Nucleic acid binder design. Structure first.
Lengths: 86, 239
RNA sequence: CGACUCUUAGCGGUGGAUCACUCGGCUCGUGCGUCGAUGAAGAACGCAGCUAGCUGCGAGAAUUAAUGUGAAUUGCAGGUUGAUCAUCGACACUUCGAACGCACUUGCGGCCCCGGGUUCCUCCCGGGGCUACGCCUGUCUGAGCGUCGCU
RNA sequence: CCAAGCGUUGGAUUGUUCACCCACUAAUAGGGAACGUGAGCUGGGUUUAGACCGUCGUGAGACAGGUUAGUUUUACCCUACU
RNA sequence: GGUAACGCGACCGAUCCCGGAGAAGCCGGCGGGAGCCCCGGGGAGAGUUCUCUUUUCUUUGUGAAGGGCAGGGCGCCCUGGAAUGGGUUCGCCCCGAGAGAGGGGCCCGUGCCUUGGAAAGCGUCGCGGUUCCGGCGGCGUCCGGUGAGCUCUCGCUGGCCCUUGAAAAUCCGGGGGAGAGGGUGUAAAUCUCGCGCCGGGCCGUACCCAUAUCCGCAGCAGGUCUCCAAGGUGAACAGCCUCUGGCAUGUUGGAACAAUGUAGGUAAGGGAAGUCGGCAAGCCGGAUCCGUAACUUCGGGAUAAGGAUUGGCUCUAAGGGCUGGCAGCCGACUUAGAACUGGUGCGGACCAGGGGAAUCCGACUGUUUAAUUAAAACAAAGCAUCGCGAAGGCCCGCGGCGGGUGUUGACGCGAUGUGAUUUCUGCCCAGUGCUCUGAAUGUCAAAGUGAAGAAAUUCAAUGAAGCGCGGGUAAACGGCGGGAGUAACUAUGACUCUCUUAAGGUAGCCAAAUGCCUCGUCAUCUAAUUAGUGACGCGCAUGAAUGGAUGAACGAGAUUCCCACUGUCCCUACCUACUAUCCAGCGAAACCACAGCCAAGGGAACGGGCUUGGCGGAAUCAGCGGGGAAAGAAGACCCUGUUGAGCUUGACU
RNA sequence: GCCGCCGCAGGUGCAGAUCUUGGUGGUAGUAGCAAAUAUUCAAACGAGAACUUUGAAGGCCGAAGUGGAGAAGGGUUCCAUGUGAACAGCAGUUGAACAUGGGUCAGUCGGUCCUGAGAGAUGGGCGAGCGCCGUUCCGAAGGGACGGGCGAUGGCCUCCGUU
RNA sequence: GUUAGGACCCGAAAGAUGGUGAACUAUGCCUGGGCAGGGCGAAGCCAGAGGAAACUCUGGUGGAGGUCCGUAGCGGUCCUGACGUGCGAAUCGGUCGUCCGACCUGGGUAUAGGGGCGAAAGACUAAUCGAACCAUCUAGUAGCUGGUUCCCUCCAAAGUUUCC
RNA sequence: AAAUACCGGCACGAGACCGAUAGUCAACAAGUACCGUAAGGGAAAGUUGAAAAGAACUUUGAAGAGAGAGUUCAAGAGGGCG
RNA sequence: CGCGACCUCAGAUCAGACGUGGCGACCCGCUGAAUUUAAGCAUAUUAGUCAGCGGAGGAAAAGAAACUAACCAGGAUUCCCU
């Protein structure tokens, strides 16, 4: 009775979509995220799981403002001017 | 019993039960109010009673919840203060009322709204008087008699719902429903009926205690269990 | 004689070692040493004529200008007054996120100004601009039987 | 003495190995075979975890002192035998 | 407007205040109105006709919203004052605080009529455009009657509680009278009367809902919340058959009918002789009519036990309503009795208790080891101790004007002790626990106080609680003795002394669920009894809320014996269902040094291989369960390890 | 693409570790496709019929249903046109597979809108710290209204929203 | 050659920080749903008779209760039956216990690991419980098991002595 | 201020190293397929040829499977093909 | 009663400027283990190390002495050899 009969009393969910990490792990009754703690002002992360951090840092996603700072850097953050005409 | 699953069941219960405030009326003269219904409350096998006093600074009708004194009925008048007549369900301070008279829902601090003698079948009789000091003696239900402050009051009579310890509860259910309208507390499991790690008294071959069931007042928790600080023990004869 | 049983060889099956290749890792060194309310890192949904994945990009969606390069891209069809390709300096970037009117159900508001119902005339359907905490400089409106003042 | 050719049984109380009584009888001799024999059975006894006493210990606990309830897995390969 | 309950189309007006509604438990009884089922007649189409049958089946209708009437309910108002008490329900229950009689009024009116609405819908009969019709025409879509039937609703009335059975958004009605509207005009404010015109954005909306779309690694005998519910027999949503709608037997076909199995039956004569044990099987079963013991807490026991009646058809007798001690007509069930009658057959299948006489355990109902223990364990009402008057007891917390008991207050919150009722509950404060007294007073740390000394250091008096000294306590934990002597036969010991502790076992009760010796011994049940029950107490180690002795009811609890009935046995037979077997198609596992006929001998002392003998003839189909010290898991028992964890106190910190 | 001689250097030689990973045997065409009664005769599609499709027979569920519709959960599995490889433990013309192409329209039916047991900001307080405790308790917590009056709009500032 | 180091390779039962779970079950709260047909006949009431008074007999009516038989539902006794490379990592069958009450179930909610909850078996806490699961400290330590890869040439032992 | 530190970032240059069971978990649509309610756990998988010249026409078959033609230095390289 | 100065204290969508969050390899401030060594183990050891919380920069932190000496005196801080 402990085994497979009670595995057939399932029709409900503890978690769902978080809306920050987006990770089906946002615990409804308690209302913070299991991955990030969404309501909490900063993140959650940790120094005991490192293969945990390196699923998820500044390389990982798009980098869509950052990948064009690095490029803008190396001549001398030039702003306003435009190259000589024809 | 220190929280969570235990805390008292408060929903179908009908109000907290008090006196009036005090004010210039109760304090320099007297006020009158009418009774509008005697009324049952749970967790408390005694009746309450609503009482429409009229507010004396705005047009309004205030409405209170005393502890109903036997012999009260509906419609009847309740006149109270420092002057008001000593008859039944009429409130006035111990300072005033004579020796011999019986009281209910009595105060301890002047103005605190009544803390003593409101369970079913309980009094707080007046004995003696000393008017330099402004102090008074009052025999309470446990044999003893508090020195009290002479301006602190009590409705007259004896508390309603009298004689409830009489009847044998018979069936085990009648317990449940008594103790299902109070708190998580019942079908109570003995201490010798627990393993080594679940109660200190129970364990082994037989179902004995082992240690004497008196204990120091100055134990810690987990231990102060049994007869606590026990002045004596056995079948009580004599007095 | 024949089947079957065992050995060895030839040729075939089954399997993917060994060898030979390498636009990938590992280690040492040098040099520079740059995120964010002017909305980050991270998420979510969208974008091709034929297109699902990796890529790249935002309702201006495999990108628009400009400076340079000077005749492609290509898997099939159609389309030199600058193709295609690198540079990146002008222009632009959905919803969430410290995330900001209130709230997480994509739900209810308040303040002004604009075009339509008009002939502001409130209500009505569209379009725009403000509406989070904390804190410093100073400006405005005030409270105090706090301390004094003069009629 | 030769002789182990042919047999050597039915019941009550007991978990019995042992014991003791009824009745019939030619007679109710004794033993081995991994103290013959659980992928042949039965689990009634001992010898897990629940429970109750009767001695011991301040106690967690203990008893050749007694009790109640407690899941017996596989064969299609070799041999053997039919 | 009306005596009035209250009625008519509107019928002005603020802050404030008062109440209504939203807003309530569960169980019984009775009545009103729809659905559904039945019963006699009319239409239309079917089916059956060898013979009979005015026959058997199908089908026969009106939404919301508005007006009009039935049907139900009133704790609503008037005249009027009633014992010779009256009215009245299945039950109740009502009344000089105004009944009977008479006359009125308000709310629900899901029923019938009306407009809707016959113009659509359903049934049949016939004609067009082959298409591409919401084609076109006709008849019909009636009338009667019953009810403790079933389903939903609506009301009225009773029972139960140390159980009194949600909140608020939203919306109305009142008291009050702040005010407002204009001078007989065209009139004014003002309307919760009828007509009319503009408008309602956003997100969800397919399908499965399961012996096939969800969870269980799968199309998995598991598991997972509701709604509607026809005929026949019955007490019946039971069991069996049938309509409406559904289905292809649940991942296969074909052939045989062997031994083993798995689930069904039957057995001549005996009847537990089988076994640890009546395990399994069988016997009894429905209703009507008689009849019923011990014992009892009088309520039970009790379907005790033990008997008889029961089909079919032909009759008789009682039990109602409506129209005007009698006449007419309208009618749905039951209940009693008599007769004729069959091969003694009738609860004909289906449903459906075996009974009796005792011992212990636990009062009863209730809970409990999911996946080896349902019990004698847990809980329980009843009994008894214990702490506590809030600056409080008990308790949580790393911390704060922290929190729980508590919206409470001694018939109250907290902590233990046994276990319903009846009868009872004796002795022990030396021991430990716990408690109450205090300067009657020996131990006493921090800090000080003082003198000696140049200071670094030492001595002296003072000296909390707790410990010592002295009271309270067994329904606080338990504990409750040893030996010699004595009666005119002998045993026997009423009596007498003597050592000891805090007393030294008082009521009762026994070879027990507890007694080693033990299968204790007299009596009872059997042909025979380590068994069961009735006494005897010497009791290794029985004994009184650490409970003692007893007892009606009760039990999937432990134990004995008698009447019933049986394939459990003497002693096994035969039948049926499905496999097994043989064929086509699909097609996995555990395990495997190398392998596989025996004697005896030695050998790490029980060899398939070695030594000495016996011997050895392809390839295989069904069975069997001797052997492989068979498979299955780095023995769970024991011992070691300077390896651990769960529990407990006088081990150490 | 590679090797000999003299010298250097090391992650340098396997039968085994119930050793790691991959592949293959004997057993074996064997164990086996056995729970809840049951099928048969004709036709028509086709290269192939014990199983699909129509028609006729005999049967089961039997209204506490193998009937009719929902909520969780699934996420297109719904519906027609085709295909015969693989899968659906024999077979397939079939399928909930595969491939292409369609399908979910509301003021009046839900969510929204109010509270329930309960969740939790600010004031305060605790804290080395991210933070925690607390919810009416150490708070100057109401940003609204009919009128009395000053002075400014709009349409003939006539009369009223608007400050 | 001895040693400190992950130190010839492979192996514990433990211990230590910081974190995720009440979608099964354990219990307290809020809010909806559910429960055939029969038996026994407690109070309260209607006459019918007996007696000087109390009060008592005979016949009806009525509908109680952790009351009985027994269906749906919840449970899980015996067969020590089937299945035991199963249909199932706990099913299925006949027989069984309860069935108007401490009943039986859906949704929302509170309690978190020396911690919760327990009508009390060391039960239950997502197939795990006499201390759950995930990552790290960590290659944790082992007087004890198992293994330890090319040839020929030459020499070849010890199980005894003191101190642990 | 400098002389010091730098297994994260932006570019660069080397190697008495490893060569697809190695070397990073990752030579390839990898922090990707898939598992867990969640914290988290996390692979396997490189090679036709110089060039697609990737086998017109015939023939058996319903279809996969075949027989002959043919390209190449070779199919004894036939689309997971040294 | 009014009028005015100061002091201590409200409120604003008043005018203009600042903080939050991220990455974390090296730097600064806290808090803080047990495995394991001692052939047992409590002080010691591991180690002011692991995990926890906080703040930065192109480097951080330190820094011109209430400094070392005992000499015939050296003369901020960091870093290497000793």
């Amino acid at each position: 009775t402990k085994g497979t009969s009670s595995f057939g009393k399932r029709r409900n969910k503890t978690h769902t979509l978080c809306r920050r990490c987006g990770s089906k792990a946002y615990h409804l009754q308690k209302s913070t995220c299991g991955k990030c703690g969404y309501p909490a002002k900063r993140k959650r992360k940790y120094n005991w799981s490192a293969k945990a951090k390196r699923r998820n840092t500044t390389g990982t996603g798009r980098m869509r403002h950052l990948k064009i700072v690095y490029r803008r850097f190396r001549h001398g953050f030039r702003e306003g001017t435009t190259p000589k005409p024809k | 019993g220190a929280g969570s699953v235990f805390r008292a069941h408060v929903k179908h219960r009908k109000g907290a039960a008090r006196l009036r405030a005090v004010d210039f009326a109760e304090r320099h003269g007297y006020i009158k109010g009418i009774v509008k219904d005697i009324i049952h409350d749970p967790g408390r096998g005694a009746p309450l009673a609503k009482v429409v006093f009229r507010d004396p600074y705005r047009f309004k009708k205030r409405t209170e919840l005393f502890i109903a004194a036997e012999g009260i009925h509906t419609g009847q008048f309740v006149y109270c203060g420092k002057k008001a007549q000593l008859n039944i369900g009429n409130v006035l301070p111990v300072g005033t009322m004579p020796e011999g008279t019986i009281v209910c829902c009595l105060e301890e601090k002047p103005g605190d709204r009544g803390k003593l003698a409101r369970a079913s079948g309980n009094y707080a009789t007046v004995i003696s008087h000393n008017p330099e000091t402004k102090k008074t003696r009052v025999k309470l239900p446990s044999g003893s008699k508090k020195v009290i402050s002479s301006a602190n009051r009590a409705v007259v009579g004896v508390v309603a719902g009298g004689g409830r310890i009489d009847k044998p509860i018979l069936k085990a259910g009648r317990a449940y429903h008594k103790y299902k309208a109070k708190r998580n507390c019942w079908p109570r499991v003995r201490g010798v009926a627990m393993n080594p790690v679940e109660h200190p008294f129970g364990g082994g071959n037989h179902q004995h205690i082992g240690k004497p069931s008196t204990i120091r007042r100055d134990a810690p928790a987990g231990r102060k269990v049994g007869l606590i600080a026990a002045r004596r023990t056995g079948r009580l004869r004599g007095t």
